Symmetry: C4
């Protein structure tokens, strides 16, 4: 019986080995960007509206051609068998049952085809490989398996400096592997090549699926993403795991939404920890959010049923926040105003 997402973090801390909790919790460098993701959300206040018709409040959205139950997807998180033996299958099953898109990772610890077979109209996250030809094979596999969007991660030319992982001497256990094919940082520097705008065009030409660029923070990169034919972007500093000192996505979101001016979907992530945070993101103009660490807390704590409980809690919090703010729909929530405060 969890009444907040924070209840799940406490539960996950109890069960996970310290080094795996640190792999999950940590960020790069001094963790300034990790902390700032939370600080930035905490400074945003919503100006709610009153006395509106709430006889049919709905939290649903249409995105990338599918109805989703909430303005929320499960973020790509590598190697989910680190957290629970059922790994990605547990999370994908719960997401399917909740009507929430699940992002299958390039570095999934269960093969993308197995996770796709769970159903639920999943997305696929791409890391750019050694060459155009192989990268494009994963994309084609994902499309053949029924994935509905390609989430191209664009903020990882290589992995950031994870000092918790370095200090812990973290490496994957023998029983966790990259099923589609700091020791994890060394492996990435060797196996993956930096993506460029040319890589984006190669992907866009290889699939009719919407291509979503994850890790955009500069306004002109958002504009360029639209010009490049992206169907969406995720405004994100990769949970503070990449450039330490990168601005939080939530701080760039409003300016990016204005610049994009409806030319693509604009998602955000980093520190979303409640339905109220989802409302803040929506009020700043997001189409939807991604949620990362909390989904893994729930997986660690109680497997598939833990993820189900998390998604049920988030669904209740989103409905609650929307109605209290006078919003019968997510579109109405996007028209809310906000104020910055001091915390």
């Amino acid at each position: 019986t969890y009444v907040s997402l924070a209840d799940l973090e406490r539960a996950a801390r109890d069960v996970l080995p310290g080094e795996i909790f640190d792999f999950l919790a940590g960020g790069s460098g001094t963790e300034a960007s990790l902390v700032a993701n939370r600080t930035a959300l905490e400074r945003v206040f919503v100006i709610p509206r009153m006395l509106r018709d709430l006889t049919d409040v709905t939290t649903e959205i249409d995105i990338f051609g599918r109805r989703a139950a909430l303005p929320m997807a499960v973020a790509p998180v590598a190697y989910q068998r680190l957290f629970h033996p059922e790994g990605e299958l547990a999370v994908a099953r719960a997401a399917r049952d909740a009507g929430v898109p699940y992002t299958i990772c390039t570095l999934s610890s269960v093969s993308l085809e197995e996770i796709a077979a769970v159903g639920g109209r999943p997305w696929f996250q791409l890391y750019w490989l050694r060459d155009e030809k192989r990268s494009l094979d994963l994309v084609r596999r994902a499309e053949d398996a029924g994935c509905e969007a390609i989430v191209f991660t664009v903020d990882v030319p290589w992995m950031g400096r994870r000092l918790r992982d370095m200090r812990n001497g973290f490496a994957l256990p023998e029983w966790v592997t990259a099923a589609n094919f700091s020791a994890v940082a060394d492996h990435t520097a060797r196996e993956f090549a930096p993506a460029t705008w040319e890589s984006v065009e190669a992907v866009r030409a290889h699939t009719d699926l919407p291509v979503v660029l994850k890790g955009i923070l500069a306004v002109e990169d958002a504009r360029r993403a639209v010009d490049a034919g992206a169907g969406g972007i995720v405004v994100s500093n990769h949970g503070g795991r990449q450039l330490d000192g990168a601005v939080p996505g939530i701080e760039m979101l409003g300016e990016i939404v204005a610049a994009v001016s409806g030319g693509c979907e604009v998602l955000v992530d980093g520190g979303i920890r409640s339905g109220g945070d989802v409302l803040k993101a929506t009020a700043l103009g997001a189409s939807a959010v991604l949620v990362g660490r909390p989904v893994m807390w729930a997986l660690a704590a109680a497997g598939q049923d833990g993820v189900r409980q998390l998604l049920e809690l988030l669904a209740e919090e989103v409905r609650d926040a929307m109605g209290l703010a006078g919003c019968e729909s997510v579109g109405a929530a996007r028209r809310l105003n906000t104020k910055l405060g001091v915390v």
Copy 2:
């Protein structure tokens, strides 16, 4: 012998059962809006005037056709028998004796007619019921009993998520009931319907009493309230108990006062804890404030006499603050300027 409102909180904490203290103290979600009500007041500084005539300083105001001794009313707080056996009668008697309006609640634990019989020209707070017909019956009862204003609460389409109450498994004791007719959250979701602008018009047509909309935060909702024929509004986030992340009323007050441009009374609440806080609210343009939790601290600590002592202390602090700031009247206090500082 209390010299500050904070002395009363300490006293109430000692006497009340933990779960009832939590029902009183708590807010929704992470309590961000609860804390922000205090932070927001603490950032406001007054620019006092000197060398003005203070030979007849008066703290009185005229509001809703009655002279009040202070620019202050007792906020609606449900179920006052939770805090002291005399409940609403103790508070209403002290308010009457102090010349302060008392707001009788829809969810009062003593009937509205009994509390009105105490005297003191009380107000009545309305929650919108299952249908127009019954809602309007409470309004007519209140008017027949001599209530002088209808304070229509507009920020409770349903009750917020009170995590202290959920964790405590809080429910009303058998000896406390809704005398006019989280377990308290479940009861509200079943018994009350979301109010709309149509509900406001139904009330306005049913009574000649001034209708005051409590829980307005958006500037256009304040304008619309005036257009709808409201006699007042209370700029309020419901003490941080409704939308977690709602802006504090004190942060919207100046902009609302400007937009309303004298078309209705503009009250504020949330975190008023001293006569100096009353002065800040007045300087930002409020007609008057409501005070909630501190009145219940005083009731818990010492019953009717506790509430009397609280109101005497607040009266002294308001007079002190006004005179130190060069204000012989509340109208002069409204013309004070303020500065935001850092705390």
Copy 3:
């Protein structure tokens, strides 16, 4: 051997009875304005100049017709025998020897004529008495005794609410009296009348000495002071002892200096604790500062010799700060720019 003013506070805390330390240290209400005086100074940063001629750095100023060794006077502090048996005589002797003006108080615990006989061209602080005639007698006594300015305190229509003094049940010991004629708050409410602009004019007509209005915070009150014929003002919230929530003087100083546009001397006080703080005040446009509590710390710690050591330390810190900032004179320091930072 004290190397900072903070060394003196530690020393005074050791020696003074708790209730007398609290009478000295405390402020009104929640002490928000007391704390804000420090916060406000800490947020100000100086932009120093380099490579200027420092062959004859001088900290002297001319003010109210006298050369002073520093841009600094000892603030009026009532009842100095509370802190040391020699009281005002010890402080006045040290101030004289340092070339710093000393402000003799209406509520001095040694008669104004005795303190004036020490020499050093002192100032006299006036509280407005029961009637024009008696007030004007103190003014005439002060002038006859050789005081060179009248510092009319304008922010005390009555004494603020000193909760430390109330809680301690503070009263003057039998051996400390008002030699020119909370128990101290009760005594003031009875003996003194609120001053007005008419009182200022009565004083201005009664003496050719410069009249300095102490406790101005509003820009139009500063302008009006010039129009009224004041020779100076002290921009001040009375060390956070009067209106709790009054803006710090340091936050109003720049705007007041601009509005006054050389029409009178503009002093500031509240929280000056180093030569660097004096430099900040000067850079914001002050003619000079007053220093209150630290002078009493020094008096408590070591009598006349303690005050001498404090003034020597402040003199060294002022010279140091000025030269490091490229200022050969106080006038050059007034032309420094500042930046607000975060602390």
Copy 4:
């Protein structure tokens, strides 16, 4: 195996005598400017760019006619034998091997000619001596020994008030001397004269080497430096060791870069503690940074090899930060935008 610069501070604290750690760590006065150097950097966030070509990322710059491996030089720090017996020779050897300029101090504890003989194309820091003739002798010695720039320190007309050193009664041990010729503060007040713009011109006429003015904070002093023929400036508050309350250099840097408009190199120092901090400085417009205390931490911890490890770590962090931010060159990093956040 250090993974951050903070690992080195912990190591240095363990080994150094307390008073020498304090000589190194401390600042003047209350250490407000020392702390502000860190606060100021922590508030700056970078807006990284994505999807750029990173096939040949280079951290090199050209400055004062030499290629440097990083946009970074070792700051002038007096008396390095305080920290390790090899002192300046250890640091200079490591800097040479890393391709980083080393600044030889006027108050070096090994003679400038010995340190220059190490190689690595060093710079020389000048304090203005008793007269033009002797000052100019050090300059000529430095030039004859192969130093490539003169870093004229302009913020030390005398040494600041180092309260840690005063409290510790710090003095140099007998075995540490000024090899080119608070007890250290007393020695400086006697031996050195305040520099002026005339001193700058005397130096500029005495050498063809670029003259770099270290300790500029005012925009017009930066402009004047260009007009005076300076080849560079270091925007700096001397690590918070000079004027307590001086603005951090990082807070003035952008405005200075705009005013200078390419007329000289603009360096910054104060609190640079990671490659991410170097990126922030570059994004604000710096040509390069200086690093002071961390180099001494490394020297204290492990001598020459410690400094080598520090420089290798900084080089890795700079490359990491640049690439994550989409910058193949330091010039691209200078074109990054930043956002101020709250911490």
